[PDB]
Write a protein that binds this DNA or RNA. Structure first.
Ligand SMILES: COc1cc([C@@H]2c3cc4c(cc3[C@@H](O[C@@H]3O[C@@H]5CO[C@@H](C)O[C@H]5[C@H](O)[C@H]3O)[C@H]3COC(=O)[C@H]23)OCO4)cc(OC)c1O
Ligand SMILES: COc1cc([C@@H]2c3cc4c(cc3[C@@H](O[C@@H]3O[C@@H]5CO[C@@H](C)O[C@H]5[C@H](O)[C@H]3O)[C@H]3COC(=O)[C@H]23)OCO4)cc(OC)c1O
Ligand SMILES: [Mg+2]
Ligand SMILES: [Mg+2]
Ligand SMILES: [Mg+2]
Ligand SMILES: [Mg+2]
Ligand SMILES: [Mg+2]
Ligand SMILES: [Mg+2]
Lengths: 669, 671
DNA sequence: AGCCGAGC
DNA sequence: AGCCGAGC
């Protein structure tokens, strides 16, 4: 009583309390479906309360965050549970307003994660209730049909023994991370083997059901080594490539298009945030943003948190996008299917390892991935050295427009330093902040405590002024001569918090086979990317030789028919379709060689000839068609004398050319 | 003096101290406008300038209830920020010592709704503290992140001060915002619309409140009518029309998310307002429950709302889908698009001034709106009755009177007199101790009736012993228990009266734009029907003219294509190896005609592309015979149309419409 | 204690 | 004391 989103069972709290079931639903929308499904009679023995999504994991969570969590407090007040209270006996259960909790979620993996978080919540606080069969689930005007069928949709969770304890702990305990790695490692291996060849116990729920979320969590959160993308990001670029927008599109509108075209199965709000992240160009985000930030996508001041609503902002492809992901290689990719609809590919195959450029980052279950940004030109140069058979030079992380320094301290560990300089004996100037330190955060958490002091720290500076621009940082700080001499003695970057450590010891990617792998150096990422991209330039040459040759044979037959027609060697006039096709066969014309070639990759068709306009017989069109035919034959031969390496070099040169123009234009604006 | 309770406020550093009267409080339209202001001020402006966002339209405090005023958080926020006190006079300089700011600078969009917000703020100060306006308390900041810092560095040229000249300023503010001035606003806007039409037949740091009201706010009041009051012709307001124009253009064969459609509408139709209002309009166009639309032109695929909550239970526009009803293009035939006047927004072609439906859609769906000085309310009418009346008028007979009719409504609508109706639900005695309610009067929602009628009957003297609910999504069933004596007493009085199942409906404001865009008051729906009929019959005449011309052009085009094909296959003509110029000149000398369809369109060198673009297939046997058939069919089709009257084509459209109306409505009842 | 981001 | 709906 007093909880606005709760519809309380009429008998809750009275003599029938333990015969009452509380339905916890995923979202308010599921509560309404459950409310209408219960009808009038269901209000006596059933309550309904909505969940806001993922529940707090209370196992290792701090006491402050637990007691301040409103959703869990609501559940506790609704059910009437008491912390630290043992439910072992029958007299103790008279404390409860509800005898059973029924979790009702989507039938998908994220629903399974909420089930497990609720199971985890009860298992941690009152293990004794689960041995009574406290928890059950509901599986799915269509709702009224479910609740009349209720026993068929009702599954009861059973606690069979200590294997149920270990399973819950395996999933939700901070101390089990390494066990989750093994747990999921053994899971992915068995699927590779299988792919190439009522009551529910908590152990079964966790190992047969929740693990599907845990694996799906990694697949959505951990990028591919090949293109550097997660599937949601890859869906975005696939949609933009297919749309080929010449003008800016509202982010919210592009997101809805992505869901339709790529079969994105999650909430669009998440897609909109991904699109925003793909377009951000501020210092510390994307070395090359593949989407253009037209409107306010956020700045280094707030670290992108100041981005405006996706309803007010627009985007389109960067001109660099199709240069890094050439459209011709789409013919080599493997495009996935979602229920008979062809969708985004397994991965794109960019011309450089984009996974290094923009700093792929993500958090899964059992594993996370963090890579810093690397310099596009430096990577191009290493690809060129490798094409010559030379070893690649080592690479330090490099952030576009970052004015500070990044120094290797050790393997995969770096010091990132901003800029500070003594101006006079009273004055220092801060012209850069370490990568991912945001201007407003630095002001509030560093300079303000330095100016005002805190309860635990003395004042240091006597004043500061802010000269920043939208992309740049300038602080001018005043200090007494004494304080500045002390600051120099301890070192200026240290005192002013301008140095941060960058450690990347989890570089975890899916390889080109879709296998999760840990990479110890970026050189190993570069090498694995290089061997794959080189063979795909081989595949591209094979594809171009075939398609260009088919196009050549096509133009040859078209030109031959036109010449024989204008010379009177052949007439189609007033001839039946059958007679014309038969005659074209007897004279040796080929069925459409492009359609034939395109179908070979997986009656005679002369339409490519007979669909030609009557203009084709005129003088200037005859001459134009002969030129096109001869041009295509020269095109075939020009391609055949290029190696895969030459083709790669052409793409690299064209990309660098545009990268210089684009980044030069950026500094102008 | 400090304010700790208003998180969205950025207080001037000197506000509340000795320099208070030298400080400005910038009120912005919305939070993003505040960020533009806070950015434009920068480090320097923080001392003498505060910024606080307004949430949109401000409470109109003139003649508002004391409760609504005291409970209004936005106004209480403004009062607390500035330090104002109700009932206090600010006259002498001593009285100003209690103010944390000496001036308020309003910063809104440079559009009409921004002007409305300016007026509401002016209204708020004028009503409570007229003395403050004599001191020059109010100012505005006009516009046409880096742009913001440019605006504020030039603030002198963007700053305009409101001036109180005298009693005509009071009259102007009262004329705009007083509930007793409705008649004066009608005259105010009548003169405006008239004087503007006359000009269409032909070719300062300070601003007085009188000039603000009469030259600026009046533009919002007029735009408020133009957006809120429907057109007699199609029954649409402009935003609804832009939706239908977009849907016709897209021609979706599959459902579309309403949020996605709204963004598509904004781009395609140049809709200038918030997309959330467009999404609500889209939801409102698709609702089929009892009491909303007799014919919904968009399909409700999702939860669009029910009669339980009166549509307020619609799910989020992000979660629901729509598309055209199959009736939409039958009511608005695509061929008549050629007769419409399409508007332009900055060289982009957008929705027409109105569609011309085959029946008066303004009577079908109950056109409704609230403007300034006028509102419009029409009930729903029955589509087949309207079709029959149109047929009666085509035959020169008199149209039957029409009572309001709501689809699937099981109750009774009785005419008390002209434009006056008693609308009754259904209640029936089952036995002694039991009555049953199977229908509620139109636009009485099931949950509201339970809460406001049956619940007070059950508890607060209690007239009934109990009730139970058998409703479905689309239907209403209440079974009510009471003592014999109480039922007899309730039955002695009206059962419909006791249970509040009768509502009166009066439509004395039927206010629409006529076909010229002139605001008109219509006394009867027969008047509406007759005015629509004359214009629509005229446009069936235009459609026939348009079709005769276009079909005739198409026939000439085919005659030339067939002639060329026949001469080619007979050897009478050869294009082989001939130059383009020689072939153009030769076709001209032989009397082939330049593209007849293009020539006809341009009428509303020679172009033989429509001939020479034909495929080589055209010279084969089957395509020759096909082309000749197509040519003769086209000639017959132009001849068949010439014989028909505009009335015959209207009858054809009505029959096709009714046939699909029958199929669609049958399928609705089976589902 | 809190960020990073694709999810609820 | 509030609905209707196109707007902020
Ligand atoms: C209130 O009703 C429900 C809420 C939810 C949660 C939720 C829960 C919250 C909360 C916020 C949210 C919100 O997340 C926010 O979305 C924002 C959308 O714009 C982008 C820019 O930034 C996002 C925020 O980063 C994110 O935090 C929802 C978005 O979609 C969800 O699943 C989220 O603050 C308080 O608790 C689930 C439900 O059922 C499944 C519900 O019925
Ligand atoms: C908080 O930030 C601002 C809010 C606003 C108002 C507003 C104001 C409100 C309020 C709500 C709203 C909200 O209206 C609601 O939108 C809903 C959108 O979906 C449909 C289904 O139903 C709509 C509601 O019928 C409507 O009531 C806004 C939507 O667009 C506006 O202009 C509205 O509740 C409290 O006061 C203006 C601003 O600056 C211009 C702001 O910065
Ligand atoms: Mg789901
Ligand atoms: Mg943690
Ligand atoms: Mg990144
Ligand atoms: Mg505006
Ligand atoms: Mg009122
Ligand atoms: Mg209506």
């Amino acid at each position: 009583k007093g909880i606005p989103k709760l519809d309380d069972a009429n008998d809750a709290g009275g003599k029938h309390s333990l015969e009452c079931t509380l339905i916890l639903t995923e979202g308010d929308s599921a509560k309404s479906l459950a409310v209408s499904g219960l009808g009038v009679i269901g209000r006596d023995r059933y309550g309904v309360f909505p969940l806001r999504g993922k529940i707090l994991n209370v196992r290792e969570a701090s006491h402050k965050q637990i007691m301040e969590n409103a959703e869990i407090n609501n559940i506790i007040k609704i059910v009437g549970l008491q912390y630290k209270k043992s439910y072992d006996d029958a007299e103790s259960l008279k404390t409860l307003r509800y005898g059973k909790i029924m979790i009702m979620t989507d039938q998908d993996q994220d629903g399974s994660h909420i089930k497990g978080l609720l199971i985890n919540f009860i298992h941690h606080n009152w293990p004794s209730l689960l041995k009574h069969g406290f928890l059950e689930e509901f599986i799915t005007k269509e709702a009224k049909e479910y609740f009349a069928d209720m026993e068929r949709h009702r599954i009861l969770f059973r606690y069979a023994g200590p294997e149920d304890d270990a399973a819950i702990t395996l999933a939700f305990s901070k101390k089990k991370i390494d066990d989750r790695k093994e747990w999921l490692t053994n899971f992915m291996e068995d699927r590779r083997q299988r792919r190439l060849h009522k009551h529910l116990t908590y152990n079964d729920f966790i190992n047969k059901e929740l693990i599907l979320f845990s694996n799906s969590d990694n697949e959505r959160s951990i990028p591919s080594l090949v293109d550097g993308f997660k599937p949601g990001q890859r869906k975005v670029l696939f949609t933009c490539f297919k749309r080929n927008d010449k003008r800016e599109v509202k982010v919210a509108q592009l997101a809805g298009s992505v869901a339709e075209m790529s079969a994105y199965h999650h909430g669009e709000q998440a897609l909109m945030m991904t699109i925003v992240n793909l377009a951000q160009n501020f210092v510390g985000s994307n070395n090359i943003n593949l989407l253009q930030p037209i409107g306010q996508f956020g700045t280094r001041l707030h670290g992108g948190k100041d981005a405006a609503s996706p309803r007010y902002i627009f985007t389109m492809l960067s001109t660099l996008a199709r240069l890094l992901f050439p459209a011709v290689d789409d013919n080599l990719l493997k495009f996935l299917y979602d229920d008979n609809q062809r969708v985004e590919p397994e991965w794109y195959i960019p011309i450089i390892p984009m996974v290094l450029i923009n700093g792929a980052e993500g958090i899964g279950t059992g594993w996370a991935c963090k890579l810093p940004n690397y310099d596009a030109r430096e990577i191009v140069n290493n690809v060129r050295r490798m094409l010559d058979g030379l070893d690649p030079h080592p690479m330090l992380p490099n952030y576009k427009n970052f004015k500070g320094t990044i120094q290797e301290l050790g393997q995969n560990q770096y010091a990132v330093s901003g800029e500070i300089f003594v101006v006079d004996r009273n004055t220092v100037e801060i012209t850069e902040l370490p990568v991912r330190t945001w201007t407003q955060v630095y002001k509030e958490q560093v300079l303000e405590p330095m100016l005002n002091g805190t309860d635990k720290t003395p004042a240091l500076i006597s004043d500061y002024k802010e000269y920043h621009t939208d992309t740049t940082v300038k602080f001018v700080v005043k200090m007494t001569e004494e304080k500045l001499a002390q600051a120099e003695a301890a070192g200026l970057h240290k005192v002013f918090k301008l140095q941060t450590t960058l450690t990347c010891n989890s570089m975890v990617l899916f390889d080109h086979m879709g296998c999760l792998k840990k990479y110890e150096t970026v050189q190993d990422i570069l090498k694995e990317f290089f061997d794959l991209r080189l063979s795909y330039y081989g595949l591209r040459k094979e594809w171009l030789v075939g398609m260009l040759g088919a196009e050549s044979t096509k133009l040859n037959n078209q030109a031959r028919f036109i010449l024989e027609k204008i010379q009177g060697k052949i007439t189609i006039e007033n001839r039946s379709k059958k007679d014309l096709i038969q005659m074209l066969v007897q004279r040796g014309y080929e069925s459409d060689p492009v359609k034939a070639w395109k179908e070979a990759q997986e009656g005679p068709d002369f339409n490519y000839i007979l669909n030609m306009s009557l203009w084709s017989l005129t003088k200037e069109k005859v001459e134009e068609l002969i030129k096109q035919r001869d041009a295509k034959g020269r095109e075939v031969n020009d391609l055949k004398r290029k190696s895969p390496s030459d083709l790669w070099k052409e793409d690299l040169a064209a990309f660098v050319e545009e990268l210089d123009k684009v980044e030069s234009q950026e500094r102008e604006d």
